[PDB]
Design a protein around this motif. Structure first.
Motif, PDB file in Angstrom:
ATOM      1  N   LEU A 218       0.816  -1.220   0.000  1.00  0.00           N
ATOM      2  CA  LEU A 218       0.000   0.000   0.000  1.00  0.00           C
ATOM      3  C   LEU A 218       0.860   1.286   0.000  1.00  0.00           C
ATOM      4  CD1 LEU A 218      -2.810   1.212  -0.081  1.00  0.00           C
ATOM      5  CD2 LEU A 218      -3.251   0.314   2.163  1.00  0.00           C
ATOM      6  N   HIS A 220       3.235   4.615  -1.712  1.00  0.00           N
ATOM      7  CA  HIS A 220       3.031   5.792  -2.578  1.00  0.00           C
ATOM      8  C   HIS A 220       3.545   5.591  -4.016  1.00  0.00           C
ATOM      9  CE1 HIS A 220       2.438   7.259   1.484  1.00  0.00           C
ATOM     10  NE2 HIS A 220       3.751   7.115   1.726  1.00  0.00           N
ATOM     11  N   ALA A 221       4.355   4.557  -4.256  1.00  0.00           N
ATOM     12  CA  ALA A 221       4.823   4.172  -5.587  1.00  0.00           C
ATOM     13  C   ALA A 221       3.646   3.767  -6.506  1.00  0.00           C
ATOM     14  CB  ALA A 221       5.836   3.031  -5.413  1.00  0.00           C
ATOM     15  N   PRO A 222       3.706   4.059  -7.821  1.00  0.00           N
ATOM     16  CA  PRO A 222       2.588   3.883  -8.752  1.00  0.00           C
ATOM     17  C   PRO A 222       1.939   2.493  -8.686  1.00  0.00           C
ATOM     18  CG  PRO A 222       4.654   4.104  -9.981  1.00  0.00           C
ATOM     19  CD  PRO A 222       4.860   4.569  -8.543  1.00  0.00           C
ATOM     20  N   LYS A 258       4.197  22.731 -10.119  1.00  0.00           N
ATOM     21  CA  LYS A 258       5.060  21.871  -9.289  1.00  0.00           C
ATOM     22  C   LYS A 258       5.764  20.836 -10.169  1.00  0.00           C
ATOM     23  CE  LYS A 258       2.638  22.983  -5.060  1.00  0.00           C
ATOM     24  NZ  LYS A 258       1.632  22.692  -4.006  1.00  0.00           N
ATOM     25  N   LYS A 259       7.041  21.077 -10.470  1.00  0.00           N
ATOM     26  CA  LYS A 259       7.813  20.335 -11.476  1.00  0.00           C
ATOM     27  C   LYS A 259       8.358  19.013 -10.918  1.00  0.00           C
ATOM     28  CE  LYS A 259      10.830  21.291 -15.416  1.00  0.00           C
ATOM     29  NZ  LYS A 259      11.487  22.353 -16.218  1.00  0.00           N
ATOM     30  N   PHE A 260       7.459  18.057 -10.677  1.00  0.00           N
ATOM     31  CA  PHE A 260       7.786  16.722 -10.164  1.00  0.00           C
ATOM     32  C   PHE A 260       8.888  16.049 -11.004  1.00  0.00           C
ATOM     33  CE2 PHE A 260       3.614  14.980  -7.864  1.00  0.00           C
ATOM     34  CZ  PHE A 260       3.426  16.178  -7.160  1.00  0.00           C
ATOM     35  N   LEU A 261       9.837  15.389 -10.344  1.00  0.00           N
ATOM     36  CA  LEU A 261      10.786  14.474 -10.989  1.00  0.00           C
ATOM     37  C   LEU A 261      10.050  13.216 -11.503  1.00  0.00           C
ATOM     38  CD1 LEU A 261      13.753  14.851  -8.453  1.00  0.00           C
ATOM     39  CD2 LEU A 261      13.437  16.077 -10.573  1.00  0.00           C
ATOM     40  N   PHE A 263       9.895  10.020 -11.202  1.00  0.00           N
ATOM     41  CA  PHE A 263       9.487   8.987 -10.249  1.00  0.00           C
ATOM     42  C   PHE A 263       8.465   9.461  -9.197  1.00  0.00           C
ATOM     43  CE2 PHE A 263      13.562  11.011  -9.156  1.00  0.00           C
ATOM     44  CZ  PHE A 263      13.380  11.405  -7.820  1.00  0.00           C
ATOM     45  N   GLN A 264       8.296  10.768  -8.984  1.00  0.00           N
ATOM     46  CA  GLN A 264       7.408  11.306  -7.947  1.00  0.00           C
ATOM     47  C   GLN A 264       5.927  11.181  -8.338  1.00  0.00           C
ATOM     48  OE1 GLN A 264       9.355  15.181  -7.548  1.00  0.00           O
ATOM     49  NE2 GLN A 264      10.526  14.550  -5.823  1.00  0.00           N
ATOM     50  N   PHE A 266       3.098  11.696  -5.710  1.00  0.00           N
ATOM     51  CA  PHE A 266       2.331  12.537  -4.785  1.00  0.00           C
ATOM     52  C   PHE A 266       3.228  13.671  -4.273  1.00  0.00           C
ATOM     53  CE2 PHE A 266      -1.449   9.766  -4.020  1.00  0.00           C
ATOM     54  CZ  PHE A 266      -0.988   8.507  -4.435  1.00  0.00           C
ATOM     55  N   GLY A 267       2.644  14.783  -3.833  1.00  0.00           N
ATOM     56  CA  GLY A 267       3.333  15.855  -3.106  1.00  0.00           C
ATOM     57  C   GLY A 267       2.749  16.051  -1.707  1.00  0.00           C
ATOM     58  N   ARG A 268       3.572  16.451  -0.727  1.00  0.00           N
ATOM     59  CA  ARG A 268       3.152  16.619   0.678  1.00  0.00           C
ATOM     60  C   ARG A 268       3.519  17.977   1.270  1.00  0.00           C
ATOM     61  NH1 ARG A 268       0.711  11.982   2.548  1.00  0.00           N
ATOM     62  NH2 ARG A 268       1.162  10.254   1.236  1.00  0.00           N
TER      63      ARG A 268
ATOM     64  N   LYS C  15       9.311   8.367  -3.078  1.00  0.00           N
ATOM     65  CA  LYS C  15       8.705   8.847  -4.336  1.00  0.00           C
ATOM     66  C   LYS C  15       7.704   9.999  -4.138  1.00  0.00           C
ATOM     67  CE  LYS C  15      10.094   4.829  -7.008  1.00  0.00           C
ATOM     68  NZ  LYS C  15       9.744   3.776  -7.999  1.00  0.00           N
ATOM     69  N   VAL C  16       8.006  10.899  -3.204  1.00  0.00           N
ATOM     70  CA  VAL C  16       7.169  12.041  -2.805  1.00  0.00           C
ATOM     71  C   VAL C  16       7.854  13.365  -3.144  1.00  0.00           C
ATOM     72  CG1 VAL C  16       6.048  13.173  -0.808  1.00  0.00           C
ATOM     73  CG2 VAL C  16       5.930  10.720  -1.040  1.00  0.00           C
ATOM     74  N   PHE C  17       7.128  14.278  -3.785  1.00  0.00           N
ATOM     75  CA  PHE C  17       7.545  15.665  -3.972  1.00  0.00           C
ATOM     76  C   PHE C  17       7.457  16.466  -2.660  1.00  0.00           C
ATOM     77  CE2 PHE C  17       6.527  20.126  -4.947  1.00  0.00           C
ATOM     78  CZ  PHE C  17       7.513  20.486  -5.879  1.00  0.00           C
ATOM     79  N   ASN C 194      12.084  23.659  -6.482  1.00  0.00           N
ATOM     80  CA  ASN C 194      11.770  22.668  -7.511  1.00  0.00           C
ATOM     81  C   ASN C 194      11.749  21.232  -6.953  1.00  0.00           C
ATOM     82  OD1 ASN C 194      11.678  24.797  -9.429  1.00  0.00           O
ATOM     83  ND2 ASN C 194      13.869  24.637  -9.867  1.00  0.00           N
TER      84      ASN C 194
END
Ligand SMILES: *[C@@H]1O[C@H](CO)[C@@H](O)[C@H](O)[C@H]1NC(C)=O
Ligand SMILES: *[C@@H]1O[C@H](CO)[C@@H](O)[C@H](O)[C@H]1NC(C)=O
Ligand SMILES: *[C@@H]1O[C@H](CO)[C@@H](O)[C@H](O)[C@H]1NC(C)=O
Ligand SMILES: *[C@@H]1O[C@H](CO)[C@@H](O)[C@H](O)[C@H]1NC(C)=O
Ligand SMILES: *[C@@H]1O[C@H](CO)[C@@H](O)[C@H](O)[C@H]1NC(C)=O
Ligand SMILES: *[C@@H]1O[C@H](CO)[C@@H](O)[C@H](O)[C@H]1NC(C)=O
Ligand SMILES: *[C@@H]1O[C@H](CO)[C@@H](O)[C@H](O)[C@H]1NC(C)=O
Ligand SMILES: *[C@@H]1O[C@H](CO)[C@@H](O)[C@H](O)[C@H]1NC(C)=O
Ligand SMILES: *[C@@H]1O[C@H](CO)[C@@H](O)[C@H](O)[C@H]1NC(C)=O
Ligand SMILES: *[C@@H]1O[C@H](CO)[C@@H](O)[C@H](O)[C@H]1NC(C)=O
Ligand SMILES: *[C@@H]1O[C@H](CO)[C@@H](O)[C@H](O)[C@H]1NC(C)=O
Lengths: 413, 419, 211, 149
Positions: A218, A220-222, A258-261, A263-264, A266-268, C15-17, C194
């Protein structure tokens, strides 16, 4: 009136509930993978493992239905940890794993987090924070035989207990004392496995049961496993309830910079609460702000003078909600005025409000006092020719009420 | 091992006195906190994040939520009162004359700069440079803007320069600035001819001492540490309150939507009550330490309001209250969350030793000085004002008689002149 | 031979921003200024693995082209083989059999396919998962592992359940490289506007880092 | 509304006790806010789990009250220390301190008692009717400079 628990409201400015608007839709997002998951190869296989050598199947790239599992007539016991079985069809997982073996019907109690005994300690160990479901059924018709089915085995002896998900298939003769065993049984030398020898005459606790342990990744990875529920269309710039990959919440979804890499996912926030997502169906970085909000303050003269009211939306711009943009926030229902007066009801950032004429709530910049220039020059003096005796009142608090509490009568009566 | 200070032996004897033959005008800064950042929390949006499932459990705890909002609102309303009681000590907005004819004293570094969008002084612009949300927390603006606070420090300063202490006790009465400084000199027990005979020196020492305030504030970054410490403590407290939302408190997750998306009602409510318990304790800890911190800011604002009345609107006889040395005068300057007082003091500067006596004998009568000390250069006797060496002939009209020569220990024989 | 690791061997922890923030995390990291072991293929023995390995190699000419990982390497148990040679990546996890001296000549449950310069990699084996992170940069220093910082990004996560205690690197036959063991450490990591990890503190290095 | 500072002390202490009583109606997650209802419906081992939720919340409710009374008592003590200083310096003396005993130059003050407090009637001289004059720091006579005493 409700926030104050009172039918009368005195003159002032009162903070009430934070400004929010009801969710327009319950949005749903999941990766659009088409394959049904191979759970028939898990639960309906003809062969099954001995518990000392438990077999793991990885489940991925597929859609499940756990309601079809937990409502199936096939199962004699079904339990879950870190998730509740009713809720599983709403979730997604980075992976699922199914661990499978035969044991007697009494010993099913050992397949739980933190357990002890031969099966838990020498055959298959769960971690304390296991997330997953344990599923079991009586298999007497498949797994018993007349005179005994001896093909199913458990580890009788080991030098030490297993770690969580440790696996060990060795059959070296167990040295129970000083005797060097050298590949044969004898005084304190014993073969490390035993069999239930299952027979159809056995009482139900000594009949074979098949067991499956579904373990849920469960993370956060896809997601590579998801439930059967279908995605909605997406919504933007409007407040909605949502599910993405199992993640629930409510807010105004928007586009974001928000320029996610790569592999990212979700953002927190600083609070660890999710502030952004990548959509599972296309690589879109949404921001999950709540509904566009602030505190609401209500400006009132006393209800003993009027039911007229003005509303301040703290820090909200008037385009996001007479109407007037104060630096404290958007003020609505107040007539803005170019005069200035002593501060009556304070709003903030130099703004005050009062009830004035045909009567209305007005808002104005506060006056600091009358302007004066002292008539200074390097040879002029003013001297008073008369005086006044002034008497003025100063009021000071000196004491307060002396309370006492019997804490045992307050708490326990 | 720390040094307490340099060791010193005072040259005491039963008949030696030291009297100062010159002075220095000192200007010293004092910085006081007056207010702190006004905050609001919606305790339901902090604890429960607009989950209705959590909100219904939070109702089972009753009025804990509204009494936390009530406590923070009382703190927020107090910060505006703390500011009002320091700065609104002028009833009228006094403004300075078009011509700055103050007898050589130069206030241009502390009076308003008309070019600026807020009309702060040059020194108030240095001060304002040296001091530096979705989770239900908000920061509320102060009632008075920085331009309103600067108009109050301007009016306090303009009243002081043009009218002395008189604007503090009634209508502002104009007086020439050198004549106001002659009253300040009488107030410290220095005879006012000492000002008029040294006016250019006193003005140059004042103008130089205000120049050292600029140089200190332009270079010594640590100077406003009292006001920066107040900004830092309030930021530290909010950052702690936000990071406590990431804690489990024994639940399966800190994320309330994990619990609600993983679990069914009866299992979820057991996990949500652990988060409600820990988040309510987290918020009670913040509001309690903000109530205790507000009580210290109020004590500091009551001190600043007392220094406004007694040092700016008056001249103070209280030792060390308005800086070190004998207080002449003080000027307010505004700063972020605070006030700065520039305290002007007379410091006596260049001692000489003299022989002294308590009384003098003439015609068998014992004479005592009216408003001075008897002092000798080693051959002759003079009477001097006590705070500045200015010797005069001992005369029937700067002395008084009481009894005969026999009673006083240490009396000396010397002729007293009769005009 | 040996060299000082300086600030090398740090990676994106999840794998979190995150952005404009300092974040504290505990993981297997190469400790700052730790004692790295150093080799010259231009020299590929079998080495231990412990809890996890940082590996890096210099580049101008493509000498070092893959790795082998396991315990006994004799087909009695599973092992990992990685090729990474700039033209190809190929990865397999069989019960492999090898010679004592494997080179590129001048039950396989899973498969994956895809000085001037410095290549950095991290290998760790946790809870039955074998995980890979990497970073690649131009450099000036031919001599040694260069002092500086840049975070390694996740390549691949393998759910493969292999127990590992030893590893080796692979050569083309008929560059310099560096090895250091990870330790369980607490790090403070800096995320810019970023969400790039731009700097880090090893909280156990010395009393100032602990401060 | 002149007495507002003393009525505020009365109002705050009434509101604190009413808040403390209203918290007895809270469940704190138990089956009931009422302790005899728990004990008349549940047997011992079940009842103690429900009672410990009430004990926990009622004890927290009472600790919150005592903490806010300790902080409020410290403000009343600061105000009483000020009133005791005003009694000495304004009633038992005449004060040179600006604005300490009302606005204007202090003459005299009188205490009056009030509920929970004191009222000072501060008597001050205020200068009232200016006239403008030309002024000088000193005067020349026989070449001697004269200053006013
Ligand atoms: C699944 O989503 C992709 C975009 O990621 C789209 O190209 C494809 O047509 C979709 N297929 C179905 C069956 O929805
Ligand atoms: C209520 O308000 C009216 C004006 O609307 C005022 O005359 C009256 O005095 C107020 N009531 C009380 C009790 O003062
Ligand atoms: C409010 O928002 C509008 C854009 O919607 C913008 O033009 C305006 O300048 C904003 N006002 C303030 C005070 O931010
Ligand atoms: C108030 O002032 C603004 C400019 O600040 C002007 O546009 C407006 O017409 C004025 N309104 C009144 C009623 O004076
Ligand atoms: C006064 O005289 C004594 C003689 O011992 C000397 O120590 C002291 O320093 C002198 N003080 C001044 C101000 O000249
Ligand atoms: C001061 O002390 C001297 C001795 O040093 C003594 O002879 C004299 O009587 C004393 N005089 C006074 C004024 O005490
Ligand atoms: C690394 O450890 C070895 C001993 O095992 C030692 O010889 C060498 O000097 C160490 N290197 C550093 C950089 O400390
Ligand atoms: C890279 O490896 C592949 C085999 O996986 C091989 O065919 C290819 O020639 C290699 N290239 C180099 C540059 O070694
Ligand atoms: C597959 O497993 C068997 C034992 O069941 C083993 O003998 C064989 O070597 C394994 N396959 C490979 C490719 O090594
Ligand atoms: C963020 O990244 C962009 C390019 O993606 C760059 O222009 C910008 O300067 C970066 N910001 C910082 C603070 O490094
Ligand atoms: C004093 O003289 C000035 C001259 O500008 C005048 O403004 C002021 O009204 C006069 N005050 C009195 C008390 O006559």
């Amino acid at each position: 009136k409700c926030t104050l628990k009172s039918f009368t409201v005195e003159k002032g400015i009162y903070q009430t509930s934070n400004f929010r608007v009801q969710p327009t839709e319950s949005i749903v997002r999941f990766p659009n993978i088409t394959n049904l998951c191979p759970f028939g190869e898990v639960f309906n296989a003809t062969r099954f493992a001995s518990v000392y050598a438990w077999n793991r199947k990885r489940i991925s790239n597929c859609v499940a239905d756990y309601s079809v599992l937990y409502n199936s007539a096939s199962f004699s016991t079904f339990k879950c940890y870190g998730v509740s079985p009713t809720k599983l069809n709403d979730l997604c997982f980075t992976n699922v794993y199914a661990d499978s073996f035969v044991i007697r019907g009494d010993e099913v109690r050992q397949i739980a987090p933190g357990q002890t005994g031969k099966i838990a300690d020498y055959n298959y160990k769960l971690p304390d924070d296991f997330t997953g479901c344990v599923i079991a059924w009586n298999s007497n018709n498949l797994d018993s035989k007349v005179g005994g089915n001896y093909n199913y085995l458990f580890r009788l002896f080991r030098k030490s207990n297993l770690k969580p998900f440790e696996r060990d298939i060795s059959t070296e003769i167990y040295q129970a004392g000083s005797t060097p065993c050298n590949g044969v049984e004898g005084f304190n030398c014993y073969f490390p496995l035993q069999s239930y020898g299952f027979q159809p005459t056995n009482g139900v606790g000594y009949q074979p049961y098949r067991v499956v342990v579904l373990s849920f990744e469960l993370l956060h990875a896809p997601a590579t496993v998801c439930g059967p529920k279908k995605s909605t269309n997406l919504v933007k710039n409007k407040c909605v309830n949502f599910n993405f990959n199992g993640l629930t919440g409510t807010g105004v979804l928007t586009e974001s910079n928000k320029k996610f890499l790569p592999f990212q996912q979700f953002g927190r926030d600083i609070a660890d609460t999710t502030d952004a997502v990548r959509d599972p169906q296309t690589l879109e970085i949404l921001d999950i702000t709540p509904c566009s909000f602030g505190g609401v303050s209500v400006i009132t003269p006393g209800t003993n003078t009027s039911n007229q009211v003005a509303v301040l939306y703290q820090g909200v711009n008037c385009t996001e909600v007479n109407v007037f943009q104060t630096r404290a926030g958007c003020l609505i229902g107040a007539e803005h005025v170019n005069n200035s007066y002593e501060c009556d009801i304070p709003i903030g950032a130099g703004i005050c409000a009062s009830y004035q004429t045909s009567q209305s709530v007005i808002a104005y910049t506060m006056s600091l006092g009358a302007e004066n220039s002292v008539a200074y020059s390097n040879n002029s003096i003013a001297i008073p020719t008369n005086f006044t005796i002034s008497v003025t009142t100063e009021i000071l608090p000196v004491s307060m009420t002396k309370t006492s509490v019997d804490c045992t009568m307050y708490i326990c009566g | 091992t720390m040094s307490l200070g340099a060791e010193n032996s005072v040259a005491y004897s039963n008949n030696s006195i030291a009297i100062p033959t010159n002075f220095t005008i000192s200007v010293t800064t004092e910085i006081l906190p007056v207010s702190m950042t006004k905050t609001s929390v919606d305790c339901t949006m902090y604890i429960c994040g607009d989950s209705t499932e959590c909100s219904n459990l939070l109702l089972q705890y009753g009025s804990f939520c509204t009494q936390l909002n009530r406590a923070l609102t009382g703190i927020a309303v107090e910060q505006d009162k703390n500011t009002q009681e320091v700065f609104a000590q002028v009833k009228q907005i006094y403004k300075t004359p078009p011509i700055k004819d103050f007898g050589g004293f130069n206030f241009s570094q502390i009076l308003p700069d008309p070019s600026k969008p807020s009309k702060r002084s040059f020194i108030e612009d240095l001060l304002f440079n040296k001091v530096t949300k979705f989770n239900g927390l908000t920061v509320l603006p102060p009632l008075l803007t920085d331009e309103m606070i600067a108009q109050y420090t301007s009016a306090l300063l303009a009243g002081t320069i043009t009218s002395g202490w008189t604007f503090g006790a009634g209508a502002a009465l104009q007086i020439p600035f050198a004549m106001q400084m002659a009253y300040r000199f009488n107030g410290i027990g220095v005879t006012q001819n000492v000002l008029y005979e040294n006016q250019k020196l006193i003005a140059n020492q004042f103008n130089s001492a205000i120049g050292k305030i600029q140089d200190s504030l332009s270079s010594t970054a640590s100077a406003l540490g009292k006001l920066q410490d107040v900004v830092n403590q309030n930021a530290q407290a909010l950052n702690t309150l936000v990071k406590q939302l990431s804690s489990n408190f024994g639940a399966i997750s800190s994320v309330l939507n994990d619990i609600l998306s993983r679990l069914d009602k009866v299992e979820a409510e057991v996990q949500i009550d652990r988060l409600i318990t820990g988040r309510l304790q987290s918020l009670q800890t913040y509001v309690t330490q903000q109530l205790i911190r507000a009580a210290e800011i109020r004590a500091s604002a009551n001190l600043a309001a007392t220094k406004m009345s007694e040092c700016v609107l008056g001249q103070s006889k209280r030792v060390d209250f308005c800086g070190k040395g004998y207080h002449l005068m003080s000027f307010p300057q505004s700063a972020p969350h605070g006030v700065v007082f520039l305290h002007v003091t007379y410091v006596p500067a260049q001692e000489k030793n003299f022989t002294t006596a308590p009384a003098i004998c003439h015609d068998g009568k014992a004479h005592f000085p009216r408003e001075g000390v008897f002092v000798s250069n080693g051959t002759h006797w003079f009477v001097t004002q006590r705070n500045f060496y200015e010797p005069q002939i001992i005369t029937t009209d700067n002395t008084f008689v009481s009894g005969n020569c026999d009673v006083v220990i240490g009396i000396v024989n010397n002729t007293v002149y009769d005009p | 031979a040996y060299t000082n690791s300086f600030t090398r061997g740090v990676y994106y922890p999840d794998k979190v921003f995150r952005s404009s923030v300092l974040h504290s995390t505990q993981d297997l990291f190469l400790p700052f200024f730790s004692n790295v072991t150093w080799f010259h293929a231009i020299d590929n023995p079998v080495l231990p693995f412990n809890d996890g390995v940082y590996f890096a190699s210099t580049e101008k000419s493509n000498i070092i082209r893959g790795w082998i990982f396991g315990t006994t390497l004799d087909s009695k148990t599973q092992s990992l083989l990685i090729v990474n040679n700039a033209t190809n990546v190929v990865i397999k996890v069989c019960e492999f059999q090898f010679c004592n001296d494997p080179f590129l000549g001048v039950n396989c449950t899973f498969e994956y396919v895809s000085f001037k310069n410095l290549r950095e990699f991290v290998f760790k084996n946790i809870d039955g998962y074998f995980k890979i992170y990497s970073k690649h940069t131009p450099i000036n220093l031919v001599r040694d592992l260069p002092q500086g910082f840049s975070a390694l990004e996740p390549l691949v996560d393998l759910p493969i359940g292999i127990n590992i205690t030893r590893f080796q690197t692979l050569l083309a036959l008929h560059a310099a490289y560096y090895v250091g063991y990870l330790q369980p450490r607490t790090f403070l990591l800096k995320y810019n506007e970023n969400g790039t990890i731009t700097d880090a503190v090893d909280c156990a290095l010395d009393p100032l880092s602990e401060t």
